[PDB]
Amino acid sequence: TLVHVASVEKGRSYEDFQKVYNAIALKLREDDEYDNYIGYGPVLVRLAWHISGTWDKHDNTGGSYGGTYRFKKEFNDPSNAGLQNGFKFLEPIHKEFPWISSGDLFSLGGVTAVQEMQGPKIPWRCGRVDTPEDTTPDNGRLPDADKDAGYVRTFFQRLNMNDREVVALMGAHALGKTHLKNSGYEGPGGAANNVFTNEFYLNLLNEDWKLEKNDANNEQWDSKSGYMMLPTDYSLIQDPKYLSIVKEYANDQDKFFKDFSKAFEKLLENGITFPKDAPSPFIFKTLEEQGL
Numbered sequence: 001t002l003v004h005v006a007s008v009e010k011g012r013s014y015e016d017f018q019k020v021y022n023a024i025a026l027k028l029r030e031d032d033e034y035d036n037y038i039g040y041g042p043v044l045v046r047l048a049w050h051i052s053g054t055w056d057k058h059d060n061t062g063g064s065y066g067g068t069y070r071f072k073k074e075f076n077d078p079s080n081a082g083l084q085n086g087f088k089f090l091e092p093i094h095k096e097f098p099w100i101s102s103g104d105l106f107s108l109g110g111v112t113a114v115q116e117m118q119g120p121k122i123p124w125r126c127g128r129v130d131t132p133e134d135t136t137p138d139n140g141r142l143p144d145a146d147k148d149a150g151y152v153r154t155f156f157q158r159l160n161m162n163d164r165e166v167v168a169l170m171g172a173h174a175l176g177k178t179h180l181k182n183s184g185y186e187g188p189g190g191a192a193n194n195v196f197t198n199e200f201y202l203n204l205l206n207e208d209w210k211l212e213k214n215d216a217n218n219e220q221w222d223s224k225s226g227y228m229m230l231p232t233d234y235s236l237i238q239d240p241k242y243l244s245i246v247k248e249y250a251n252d253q254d255k256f257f258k259d260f261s262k263a264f265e266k267l268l269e270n271g272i273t274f275p276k277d278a279p280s281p282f283i284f285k286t287l288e289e290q291g292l
């Protein structure tokens with residue numbers, strides 16, 4: 001069976017990775033005009049999720065470990081349309097710190113983005129190791145958005161995610177927006193789309209949603225406030241188990257933050273065996289916590 005053992009970049013410690021975090025965070029601060037002033041935070045979170053979400057628990061293929069998004073098959077996956085923006089953002093960071101692995105860089109970008117957008121601390125472990133082009137997973141492992149709750153549940157079980165983890169992870173859809181040219185969907189999930197909050201759940205419960213076709217002829221749910229939900233988003237209030245958890249997170253942002261942090265770390269670590277003597281997970285300071 002395929003095993004991927006975490007191997008710390010030789011000679012590196014917490015402080016080295018904090019420097020990489022800081023470079024990402026400083027560039028996030030600088031590049032604030034991207035995507036009509038949203039900034040790069042959301043697309044970096046999506047990149048970290050898409051490089052991880054190719055994992056298959058049945059044979060340990062895909063996942064974040066190998067950094068295989070750098071290869072054309074995966075870079076050009078139609079499911080990844082738009083993520084090239086995140087890759088280009090990270091290019092100068094990788095040039096500044098060439099010692100970091102691709103998987104560590106892509107995953108760290110997501111952690112940095114969540115924290116810099118005032119989200120929870122996400123513990124992060126190093127040691128993903130670049131693997132060759134023939135280890136790149138085929139396209140088609142990332143999820144469709146036109147589906148229902150049953151599809152969502154079945155999909156996420158391939159990643160060993162349970163209902164609470166699924167609902168918590170989807171809270172990231174308060175970030176950024178859908179772009180018609182990338183995915184055939186258009187619009188934001190809420191008003192505060194570059195600050196990490198529980199707005200996704202509040203909006204799911206409190207907005208007046210109308211099912212409509214968009215200009216790409218796909219169905220999405222649109223509110224009078226100018227927000228949208230993907231069919232897979234809206235499925236979280238159609239399924240009774242998911243709905244219960246949506247209510248919990250709409251009522252308690254702190255609980256959402258706690259559960260999101262665990263689920264996101266788990267997502268980014270699926271497929272990786274951490275030696276029992278590996279470093280403990282790192283918790284990076286924000287720029288603000290460092291006075292930078």
Ligand code: HEM
Nearest residue numbers: 042043045046049144145169172175176177178179182183
């Ligand atoms: C059923 C599972 C999911 C589906 C079907 C889905 C689908 C989508 C779609 C269609 C887009 C729009 C892409 C575009 O037009 O640019 C999007 C954006 C996004 N996705 Fe998801 N997603 C899923 C789960 C997740 C998860 C688990 C996370 C992270 C924890 C995530 C984070 C994001 C973020 C942050 C964006 C905004 C990107 C930007 O503004 O550039 N998604 N997703």
Ligand SMILES: Cc1ccc(N)nc1
Nearest residue numbers: 173177178189228229
């Ligand atoms: C990126 C995004 C925006 C809104 C929503 N409901 N889902 C995902």
